[PDB]
Amino acid sequence: VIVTRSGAILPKPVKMSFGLLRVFSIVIPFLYVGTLISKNFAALLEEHDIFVPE
């Protein structure tokens, strides 16, 4: 809705201070952390002769 019960207008939507920066400062580092986790687990699995792709 864009108006109240009367003709008045709703207040301005409260935005978050530096929202996009605050979300991209969380997405990317944890993305790289997950990449590191995957690399280390794959290396540990292949070193002990458990799963080798080819």
């Binding site: 864009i2 009367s6 008045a8 301005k12 978050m16």
Partner: protein
């Protein structure tokens, strides 16, 4: 937004059936879907609203209105306090219908 959806559809189709095979283009689609699912959650995290089409449209309209009203220096506060007084006086007129037309006791506030 509709044009961008169509553009992405076209890009994926052209790169899937002409240049690169589907065996190369399936992971791209999966990760695009997952990224969309993650962005629809970041939207809620940072706006405290669930990503629904009409609610997003209303929020964007309100932001555009409250920017165009600041650019034009429109006395929005006076407008709101003037549109609430007409509403108050009409609710009072609606209340005054009982004791003046049908001779019934007046309804209380609320």
């Amino acid at each position: 937004g509709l044009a961008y959806m169509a553009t992405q559809f076209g890009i994926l189709a052209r790169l899937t059936w002409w240049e690169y095979s589907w065996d190369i283009m399936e992971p791209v689609t999966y990760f695009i879907t997952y990224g969309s699912a993650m962005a629809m959650y970041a939207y809620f995290v940072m706006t405290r609203q669930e990503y629904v089409y009409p609610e997003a449209r209303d929020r964007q309209y309100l932001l555009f209105f409250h920017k165009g009203a600041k650019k034009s220096r429109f006395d929005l506060e006076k407008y709101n306090q003037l549109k609430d007084a007409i509403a108050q006086a009409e609710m009072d007129l609606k209340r005054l219908r009982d004791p003046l037309q049908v001779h019934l006791p007046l309804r209380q506030i609320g």
